[PDB]
Design a binder for this molecule. Structure first.
Ligand code: HEM
Ligand SMILES: NCCc1ccc(O)c(O)c1
Length: 453
């Protein structure tokens, strides 16, 4: 069969379609019009966007397709190096770092990070406890302060002290500006136009800022010899069972930058969309709050208590279903293959999985796919393979998944234990797109339940 393709702009092909502030949302609209697969061409390149579980399940066959670095992660690679997110499967440092780090990221490994997660969560709750009557909460802003500080404490025992600041630590400022330069580069018509000599200079400065801090901490740690409960300690002690090698210090620095750059925002966006859905759905808020009150019976939550927050984890999954915050991933065909019995592909041909549209497949979820209903996840095993994929696929799935979910369930539990919430502005959802998705401008008021920490 011949594939549909959205509107063209002469020699620019479909490229101007992505020249917008909200390209993923634009691509979802196109998928609504064109269906489970469409061709997307730009000068010099072609990809095919997949939206159905029928075709996505084939794309997720790792014997047939492997991760592709699309343009964004290619630009992110300029500062994240050959860290796990920006490396090809066939690079020696991807398999080395995968094998060393998968055990430091498992559900069991979360017991080790739990106390430093509670440290930063307690700072968030004390913040909101200390608001005056007339004040409000800037949700994504505070959620980013929490996840950056949590990843810096668990990753390398470094305190950004985001809740002590209006201007973030210089490393955060450089990192955020670096991710922005990377994303902006996707829409830049003439990247060598002297209008960007300042943007290129700033990018190199930002690379230098991030490198210097992270190298300095690594060095500081190797010298002291201090063992901590962070990922840096595991990375200095770890050896790949396959090669027998450890990660070198350059690659360790790249992984620390990666954890921060690639993990903080998808996680803070998750928390912010989950609070959005709960304030707009007071029956589900109340159910999640009754579970938090029933389960979090101690002044600070334990690892075991967080695991008992079943309905909070359903709310988190349902927010990921409607707005998966890391919204697409790219693949390439390892060999010639026919996709879906209908679409012949050649070795090297690219696919994109458009996650929000997968998660609207009515053949899997039913007709009410736009509705927020946590109870879809009462028994997650009922969901078919490759139907719910907010964390990617296979060996190249998110290595942060259990970290993100521990963090988000711990924090949303404490928030629901400690405050009632009001959508005092009747906020209208506005989804900003960076590397990730979040509800821009989402604000709420909290009223303390006056329960001790
Ligand atoms: C709700 C939060 C998050 C979501 C939705 C998310 C989603 C994803 C997805 C979709 C990918 C696959 C990307 C691809 O195929 O190109 C991935 C990879 C990755 N994520 Fe996450 N992530 C989240 C949180 C995090 C956290 C907290 C960390 C680290 C502390 C993290 C670190 C990584 C890394 C290193 C990879 C690359 C893994 C590999 O390819 O070996 N992520 N993530
Ligand atoms: N750890 C998430 C990093 C990330 C960000 C955006 C995406 O589209 C993606 O596939 C992965």
């Amino acid at each position: 069969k011949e594939m549909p393709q959205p509107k063209t702009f002469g020699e620019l092909k479909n490229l101007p379609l992505l020249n917008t502030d909200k390209p993923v949302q634009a691509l979802m609209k196109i998928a609504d019009e064109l269906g489970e697969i469409f061709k997307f061409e730009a000068p010099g390149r072609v990809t095919r966007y997949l939206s159905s579980q029928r075709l996505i399940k084939e794309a997720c066959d790792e014997s047939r397709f492997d991760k592709n670095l699309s343009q964004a992660p290619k630009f992110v690679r300029d500062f994240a190096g050959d860290g796990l997110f920006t490396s090809w499967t066939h690079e020696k440092n991807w398999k080395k770092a995968h094998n060393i780090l998968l055990p430091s990221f498992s559900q069991q490994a979360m017991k080790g990070y739990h106390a430093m997660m509670v440290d930063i969560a307690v700072q968030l709750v004390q913040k909101w406890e200390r608001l005056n009557a007339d004040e409000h909460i800037e949700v994504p802003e505070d959620m980013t302060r929490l996840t950056l500080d949590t990843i810096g404490l668990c990753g390398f025992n470094y305190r950004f002290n985001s809740f002590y600041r209006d201007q973030p630590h210089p490393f955060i400022t450089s990192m955020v500006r670096a991710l922005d330069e990377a994303m902006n580069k996707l829409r830049r018509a003439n990247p060598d136009d002297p209008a960007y000599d300042e943007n290129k200079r700033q990018f190199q400065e930002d690379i230098k800022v991030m490198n210097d801090l992270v190298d300095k901490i690594i060095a500081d740690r190797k010298a002291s010899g201090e063992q901590s409960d962070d990922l840096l300690t595991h990375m200095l002690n770890g050896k790949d069972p396959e090669t027998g090698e450890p990660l070198d210090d350059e690659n360790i620095r790249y992984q620390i930058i990666t954890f921060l750059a690639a993990g903080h925002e998808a996680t803070s966006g998750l928390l912010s969309f989950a609070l959005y859905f709960l304030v707009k759905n007071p029956h589900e808020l109340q159910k999640a709050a009754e579970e938090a009150a029933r389960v979090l019976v101690d002044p600070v939550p334990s690892y075991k208590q967080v695991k008992q927050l079943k309905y909070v984890g359903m709310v988190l999954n349902e927010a990921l279903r409607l707005w998966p915050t890391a919204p697409a991933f790219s693949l390439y065909a390892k060999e010639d293959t026919v996709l879906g019995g209908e679409y012949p592909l050649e070795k090297g041909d690219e696919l994109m999985v458009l996650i929000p549209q997968l998660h609207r497949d009515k053949t899997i979820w039913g007709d009410d796919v736009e509705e927020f209903r946590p109870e879809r996840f009462e028994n997650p095993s009922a969901i078919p393979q490759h139907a719910f994929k907010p964390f990617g696929n296979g060996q190249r799935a998110c290595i942060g998944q259990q970290f993100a979910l521990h963090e988000a369930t711990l924090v949303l539990g404490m928030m629901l234990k400690h405050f009632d919430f009001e959508d005092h502005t009747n906020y209208e959802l506005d989804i900003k797109e960076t590397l990730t998705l979040k509800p821009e401008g989402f604000v709420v008021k909290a009223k303390s339940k006056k329960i001790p920490l």
